[PDB]
């Protein structure tokens, strides 16, 4: 296929050009809602913790795909391993509220607590990058609420019915080899 490159109009040529035949493709695994719908670790924790998806690891499957979008929307599920009772408050609540039982409070039940939470931000969508100030960091209002317990040992988050807008760069490991990045792929023993 020959075209005007400068106009940046998408051009998808096929093997039919030289006598091949384009096959059937199944892309469910690259569906956005599907791929983001799995639990990932948060890692930097304190007994009082504001749920911010930007605390996912930047190279993790979910963390990287999330950062490869500018804006997003989703509901959330969380799994928390904690000592004491766990309290959650919505986006916008005074930190002080975390101490009261009138807010969703989950009484300890081993081994951990799993909860479904709705999106509570005051914005129609949230962003992974924000070019400005609200008073670089993100505005304080970009969060899914906060949780508190005597001790928070582990926190997993799962994006539900995710929507992503405006793609941004997504990088693989850089290659020093000069031909291919090689690594140990799983193979049977003996």
């Amino acid at each position: 296929t020959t075209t005007t490159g400068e106009s940046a109009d998408p051009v998808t040529t096929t093997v039919e050009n030289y006598g091949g035949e384009t096959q059937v493709q199944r892309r469910q695994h690259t569906d956005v809602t599907f791929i983001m719908d799995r639990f990932v670790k948060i890692q930097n924790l304190n007994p009082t913790h504001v749920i911010d998806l930007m605390q996912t690891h930047q190279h993790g499957l979910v963390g990287a795909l999330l950062r490869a979008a500018t804006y997003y929307f989703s509901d959330l599920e969380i799994v928390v391993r904690h000592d004491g009772n766990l309290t959650w408050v919505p986006n916008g609540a005074p930190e002080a509220a975390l101490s009261n039982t009138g807010n969703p409070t989950a009484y300890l039940k081993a081994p951990f607590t799993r909860l479904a939470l709705p999106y509570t931000a005051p914005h129609r969508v949230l962003a992974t990058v924000y070019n400005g100030t609200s008073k670089a960091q993100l505005p304080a209002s970009f969060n899914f609420g906060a949780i508190q317990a005597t001790t928070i040992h582990e926190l997993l988050v799962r994006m539900k019915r995710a929507e992503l807008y405006c793609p941004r760069p997504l990088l693989a490991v850089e290659v020093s080899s000069q031909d291919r990045h090689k690594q140990k792929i799983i193979a049977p023993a003996k």
């Binding site: 093997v15 006598g19 091949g20 035949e21 384009t22 096959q23 059937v24």
Partner: protein, 207 residues
């Protein structure tokens, strides 16, 4: 009707002592155009024809279990062989004729079988080689065995320089017996033709 003529391309073989044709595992071929070749495969009929190979000399001293094998494809100096060196991927089945010419005064029995994914068999496993597509050759009855098999394997196209899916196997079931009027030994030959030859991925020239 013990008389049979087989044609593969511009080559024919006629035998007057045959017990028919054994088809192994299937009577037709799986689909030759799948996703792995993206419609770039082509058929090469000029390769579908008989080539020859001596397997061994069946003598009275070889006992039950004596086994001779031929992994396929084997070195080929004609059109088929050229395809193996010029294309990255190939697939084909086999039309196999094995002859063991002595005379009717010889006795004994050979098992002729086509085996997928050859592994050296232990002595006890040889008692079950009839699980594979086969025919027997007994001088009192026939001088020719004829087996036809399709292409198979974990991959729809193969790289024959790295994997040989089929192996022709000839095993002594009962030793060759001789008389004053019989032949003293029988030379066993194979007349093989590759079938439904398809290639994909033309390679560059070496010069």
């Amino acid at each position: 009707d013990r008389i049979l003529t087989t044609r593969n391309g511009h080559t024919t073989s006629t035998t007057q002592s045959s017990v028919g044709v054994t088809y192994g595992y299937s009577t037709q071929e799986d689909h030759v155009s799948g996703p792995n070749t993206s419609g770039l495969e082509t058929r090469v009929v000029q390769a579908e024809r008989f080539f020859k190979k001596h397997l061994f000399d069946w003598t009275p001293d070889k006992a039950f279990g004596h086994l001779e094998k031929l992994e396929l494809p084997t070195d080929h100096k004609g059109v088929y062989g050229f395809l193996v060196d010029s294309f990255a991927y190939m697939r084909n089945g086999w039309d196999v004729e094995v002859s063991a010419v002595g005379n009717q005064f010889n006795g004994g029995c050979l098992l002729v079988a086509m085996v997928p994914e050859w592994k050296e068999f232990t002595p006890r496993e040889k008692y079950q080689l009839t699980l594979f597509p086969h025919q027997f050759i007994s001088p009192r009855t026939n001088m020719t065995a004829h087996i036809v098999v399709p292409y198979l394997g974990v991959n729809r196209y193969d790289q024959y320089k790295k994997h040989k899916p089929w192996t022709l196997v000839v095993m002594v079931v009962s030793p060759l017996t001789t008389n004053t009027v019989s032949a003293g030994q029988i030379k066993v030959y194979a007349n093989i033709a590759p079938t439904h030859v398809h290639v994909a991925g033309e390679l560059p020239s070496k010069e």
